[PDB]
Amino acid sequence: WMNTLIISAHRKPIDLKAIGKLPIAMRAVTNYVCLKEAYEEQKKKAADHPNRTPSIWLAMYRAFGRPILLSSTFRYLADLLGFAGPLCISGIVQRVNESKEFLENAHVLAVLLFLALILQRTFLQASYYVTIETGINLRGALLAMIYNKILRLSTSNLSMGEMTLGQINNLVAIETNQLMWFLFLCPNLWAMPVQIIMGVILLYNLLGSSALVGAAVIVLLAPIQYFIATKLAEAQKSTLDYSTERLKKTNEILKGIKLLKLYAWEHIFCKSVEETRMKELSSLKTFALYTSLSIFMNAAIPIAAVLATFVTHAYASGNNLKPAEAFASLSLFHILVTPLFLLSTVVRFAVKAIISVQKLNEFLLSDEIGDVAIKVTNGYFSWGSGLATLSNIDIRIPTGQLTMIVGQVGCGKSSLLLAILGEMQTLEGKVYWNSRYSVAYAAQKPWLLNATVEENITFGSSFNRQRYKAVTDACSLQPDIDLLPFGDQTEIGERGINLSGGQRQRICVARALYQNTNIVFLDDPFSALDIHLSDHLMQEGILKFLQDDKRTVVLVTHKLQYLTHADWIIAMKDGSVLREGTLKDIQTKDVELYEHWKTLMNRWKTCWWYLTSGGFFLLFLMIFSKLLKHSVIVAIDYWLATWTSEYQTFYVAGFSILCGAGIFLCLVTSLTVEWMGLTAAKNLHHNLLNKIILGPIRFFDTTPLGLILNRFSADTNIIDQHIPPTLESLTRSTLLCLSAIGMISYATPVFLIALAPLGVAFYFIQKYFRVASKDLQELDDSTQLPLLCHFSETAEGLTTIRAFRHETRFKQRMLELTDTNNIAYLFLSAANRWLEVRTDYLGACIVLTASIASISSGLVGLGLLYALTITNYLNWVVRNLADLEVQMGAVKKVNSFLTMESENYEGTMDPSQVPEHWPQEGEIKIHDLCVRYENNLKPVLKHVKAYIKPGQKVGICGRTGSGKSSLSLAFFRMVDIFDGKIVIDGIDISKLPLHTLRSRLSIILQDPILFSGSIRFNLDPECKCTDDRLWEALEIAQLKNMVKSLPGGLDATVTEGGENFSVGQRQLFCLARAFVRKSSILIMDEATASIDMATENILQKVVMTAFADRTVVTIAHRVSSIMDAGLVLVFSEGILVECDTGPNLLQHKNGLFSTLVMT
Ligand SMILES: CC(C)CCC[C@@H](C)[C@H]1CC[C@H]2[C@@H]3CC=C4C[C@@H](OC(=O)CCC(=O)O)CC[C@]4(C)[C@H]3CC[C@]12C
Ligand SMILES: Nc1ncnc2c1ncn2[C@@H]1O[C@H](COP(=O)(O)OP(=O)(O)OP(=O)(O)O)[C@@H](O)[C@H]1O
Ligand SMILES: Nc1ncnc2c1ncn2[C@@H]1O[C@H](COP(=O)(O)OP(=O)(O)O)[C@@H](O)[C@H]1O
Ligand SMILES: CCC(C)(C)/N=C(\NC#N)Nc1cccnc1
Ligand SMILES: [Mg+2]
Ligand SMILES: [Mg+2]
Phi first, then psi: give them for residue 907, nearest 5 degrees. Answer: 75, 170
Domain end: 878, 899, 920, which one? 899
Of 850, 839, 844, the closest CA to residue 752 belongs to 850
Q: Ligand 3, residue 965: give the atom nearest the CA.
A: 23
Q: How far is CA 975 from CA 123, 170, 971, 1004, 1103, in A?
A: 66, 35, 9, 16, 27
Q: Which of 579, 576, 582, 583 is nearest to 603 (CA)?
A: 583
Sheet with 576-581: list strands edge to edge.
439-442, 519-523, 552-556, 402-407, 568-573, 576-581
Look at residues 169, 278, 189 and name the one whose alpha carbon lies nearest to residue 789: 169
Closest CA to 165 of 28, 353, 355, 363: 363
Q: For residue 1055, how far is its CA from the centre of ligand 2 (angstroms)? A: 13
Decide if 689 contacts 270 (C-beta within 8 A).
yes
- Strand 941-947 and strand 924-932: pairing? antiparallel
Q: Is the CB of 337 under 6 A from ligand 4?
A: yes
Element (H, E) at 132: helix 106-150
SS (H, E, C) 954-1018: EEEECCCCCCHHHHHHHCCCCCEEEEEEEEECCEECCCCCHHHHCCCCEEECCCCCCCCEEHHHH
Q: Are residues 157 and 266 in the same domain?
A: yes
C-alpha 190/C-alpha 356 separation (Å) is 21
Distances (CA, A) of 1145 to 1051, 1111, 1112, 1123, 1151: 47, 21, 19, 9, 7
Domain boundary among 600, 634, 655: 600
Residue 369 per-residue DSSP state = -
Which backbone phi and psi does 379 adopt, to 5 degrees? -95, 140
**What is the SS3 string spanning 20-70?**
CCCCHHHCHHHHHHHHHHHHHHHHHHHHHCCCCCCCHHHHHHHHHHHHHHH
Is the separation of the CB atoms in 1081 and 982 below 8 Å? no
Q: Which residues contact 336 (CB under 8 A, 6 or more apart)?
A: 195, 196, 199, 200, 203, 218, 302
> Alpha-carbon distance 641 to 861, whole Å?
8
Contact assessment for residue 848 and residue 739, using Cβ atoms and an 8 Å cutoff: no
Experimental approach was cryo-EM
Do 1008 and 1069 form a contact (C-beta atoms < 8 A)?
Answer: yes
- % helix, strand, coil for the chain, step of 5: 65, 10, 25
984 CA to centre of own chain = 43
Looking at the structure, tell me whether residues 639 and 516 fall in a common domain: no
For the chain, the domain total comes to 3
- Asked if 867 and 851 count as a contact pair (C-beta separation under 8 A), the reply is yes
d(CA 130, CA 147) in angstroms, rounded, equals 26
Contact 401, 567 (CB under 8 A): yes
Beta bridge partners of 1139: 1129
Query: Is there a contact between 939 and 930 (Cβ–Cβ < 8 Å)?
Result: yes
Q: Assess whether 1128 and 1144 both reside in one domain.
A: yes
- Please check whether residues 400 and 345 belong to one and the same domain: no
In whole angstroms, give the CA distance from residue 961 to residue 284: 50
CB 875 within 8 A of CB 839: yes
3 state SS for 71-96: HHHHHHHHHHHHCCHHHHHHHHHHHH
Distance CA 107, CA 105 (A): 5
Q: Give 940 Cα–ligand 3 centroid separation in angstroms.
A: 7
Q: Let me know if residue 972 belongs to a domain.
A: no
- φ, ψ dihedrals at 629, nearest 5°: -55, -50
HEC sequence for 427-453: CCCEEEECCCCCEEEECCCCCCCCCEH
CATH number for the domain that contains residue 105: 1.20.1560.10
Find out whether 1122 and 1040 touch, Cβ atoms under 8 Å.
Answer: no
> What is the C-alpha end-to-end distance of the chain, expressed in Å?
74
Element (H, E) at 758: helix 751-795
Assigned domain for 987 exists: no
In contact, 533 and 960? CB cutoff 8 Å: yes
Tell me, yes or no, whether 425 and 518 share the same domain. Answer: yes
Residue nearest to atom 24 of ligand 2 (CA): 409
CB distance 1006 to ligand 3 below 6 Å: no
| Listed residue (880, 835, 874, 895) closest to 724, CA to CA | 880
| CA 1069, chain centre distance (Å) | 29
Final residue in a domain of this structure, among 600, 630, 653: 600
Four-CA torsion 4, 8, 13, 16, nearest 10 degrees: -30
DSSP conformation letters of 166-234: HHHHHIIIIIHHHHHHHHHHTTHHHHHHHHHHHHHHHHHHHT-THHHHHHHHHHTHHHHHHHHHHHHHH
Q: How many CA atoms lie less than 13 Å away from 967 in the CB half-sphere? A: 37
Q: Is 702 exposed, middle or buried (0-12, 13-18, 19+ CB in 10 A)?
A: exposed
In a domain, 577, yes or no: yes
CATH number of 1095's domain: 3.40.50.300
Ligand 4 binding pocket mutation candidate from 203, 306, 334 (most atoms within 8 A of CB): 334
Decide if 39 is inside a domain: yes
Residue 229 Cβ < 6 Å to ligand 1: yes
Q: Map residue 356 onto helix, strand or coil.
A: helix
Claim to verify: residue 783 and residue 834 sit in the same structural domain: yes
Are the C-beta atoms of residues 636 and 306 closer than 8 Å to each other? yes
Q: Is residue 160 part of a domain?
A: yes
Strand (E) or helix (H) holding 520: strand 519-523
786 and 713 in a common domain: yes
Q: What are phi and psi of 910, to 5 degrees?
A: -65, 135
Atom of ligand 1 nearest to the CA of 230: 23
Count CA within 13 A, CB hemisphere, residue 1036.
22
Dihedral angle computed from the Cα positions of residues 218, 219, 223 and 226, in that order, rounded to the nearest 10 degrees: 70
| Residue 910 belongs to a domain | no
Q: Could you tell me if 78 and 124 are in contact, meaning their C-beta atoms sit under 8 angstroms apart?
A: yes
Closest CA to 456 of 400, 514, 498, 405: 514
With beta carbons less than 8 A apart as the criterion, state whether 530 and 959 touch: yes
Question: Is residue 963 part of an annotated ligand binding site?
Answer: yes
CA atoms lying within 13 Å on the CB side of residue 254:
27
The number of CA neighbours under 13 Å toward the Cβ of 196 is: 27
Residues 6+ away with beta carbon under 8 Å from 1037: 1068, 1069, 1071, 1072, 1075, 1099
d(CA 179, CA 907): 52
CA–CA distance, 1123 with 956 (Å, rounded to integer): 10
Compute, in angstroms, the gap from residue 1040 CA to the centroid of ligand 2.
16
In angstroms, the CA 1095 to CA 1000 distance is: 28
Instruction: Quote the distance between the C-alpha of residue 76 and its chain's center.
Output: 39
Pairing of strands 1127-1132, 1053-1054: unpaired
How many other β-carbons are positioned within 10 Å of the β-carbon of residue 416? 27
Nearest protein Cα to ligand 3, atom 2: 933
Amino acid present at 1031 = W
Q: Do 341 and 465 fall into the same domain?
A: no
Strands (E), 693-772: none
Cβ neighbours, 10 Å, residue 1158: 11
Cα separation, 836 vs 842, in Å, equals: 10
| Length of the chain, in residues | 1159
271 exposed, middle or buried (CB, 10 Å; 0-12, 13-18, 19+)? exposed
Give the whole-angstrom CA distance, residue 347 versus residue 185. Answer: 10
Residue 895: which residues within 8 A CB-CB, separation 6 or more? 606, 609, 684
**Cα dihedral: 255, 259, 261, 265 (round 10):** -100
CA dihedral 481, 483, 485, 488 (to 10 degrees): 20
Domain span at 524: 372-600
Distance from C-alpha of 376 to C-alpha of 572, rounded to nearest angstrom: 15
Amino acid letter, residue 1049:
G
CA distance 94 to 1078: 93
Total Cβ atoms within 10 A of residue 482: 10
Q: Which of 634, 620, 632, 723 is nearest to 672 (CA)?
A: 620
* Amino acid present at 1047: P
Crossing angle for the helix pair 323-341 and 723-747, to the nearest 10 degrees:
160
Same domain, 765 and 875: yes
Ligand 5 mean position, distance from CA 523 (Å): 6
Residue 350 and residue 385 share a domain: no
Phi first, then psi: give them for residue 929, nearest 5 degrees.
Answer: -80, 135
Alpha-carbon distances, residue 921 vs 1110, 1125, 1156 (angstroms): 8, 18, 32
* CA atoms of 1126 and 927, how far apart (whole Å): 19
Alpha carbons 219 and 305: distance in angstroms, whole number: 10
Query: What is the rounded distance in angstroms from the CA atom of residue 787 to the CA atom of residue 822?
Result: 11
| Pair 355, 236: CB distance under 8 Å | yes
Atom 13, ligand 2: residue with shortest CA distance: 410
What does the alpha-carbon distance between residue 1081 and residue 1000 come to, in Å, rounded to a whole number? 8
Burial 612-624 (b: 16+ CB within 10 A, else e): ebbeeebbebbee
Tell me the residue type at 437: Y
What three-state secondary structure class fits 1130? strand
CA distance 224 to 27: 42
Q: Is the CB of 193 under 6 A from ligand 1?
A: yes
Instruction: Give domain status of residue 918, yes or no.
Output: no
Please choose, from the candidates 728, 740, 733, the residue with its C-alpha nearest in 3D space to the C-alpha of residue 622. Answer: 728
Q: Which residues contact 665 (CB under 8 A, 6 or more apart)?
A: 625, 628, 629, 632
- Is the minimum distance from the CB of 963 to ligand 3 under 6 angstroms? yes
φ, ψ dihedrals at 154, nearest 5°: -80, 145
Q: Which atom of ligand 4 is nearest to the CA of 333?
A: 1
CA distance 311 to 314: 5
- Whole-angstrom Cα distance, residue 396 to residue 552? 12
Longest alpha-carbon distance in the chain: 123
What is the distance between the alpha carbons of residues 156 and 368, in angstroms, rounded to a whole number?
A: 9
Confirm whether residue 135 is marked as ligand binding: no
The vertex-266 CA angle with 265 and 272, nearest 5°, equals: 95
The answer to whether residue 929 sits within a structural domain is: no
Per the DSSP assignment, residues forming a β-bridge with 554 are 403, 521
- Backbone φ and ψ for 456, nearest 5 degrees, come out as -65, -40
Say how far apart CA 831 and CA 878 lie, in whole Å: 13
Reported as type and span, the H/E element at residue 489 is: none
Same domain, yes or no: 1035 and 1113: yes
DSSP symbol at 552: E
CB atoms within 10 A of CB 893: 18
| 3-state class (DSSP) for residue 925 | strand
Asked if residue 620 and residue 574 are part of one domain, the reply reads no
Under a CB-based contact definition with an 8 Å cutoff, are residues 630 and 665 in contact?
A: no
Give residue ranges with CB within 6 A of ligand 2: 159, 383, 389, 409-415, 444, 524, 1059-1064, 1090
Tell the burial category of 120 from Cβ atoms under 10 Å away from its Cβ (0-12, 13-18, 19+).
buried
Does residue 961 have its Cβ closer than 6 Å to ligand 3? yes
857 is in an annotated binding site: no
Q: What does R_g of the chain's alpha carbons equal in angstroms?
A: 36
**DSSP annotation of 537:** I
Residues 6+ apart with CB under 8 A from 433: 373, 374
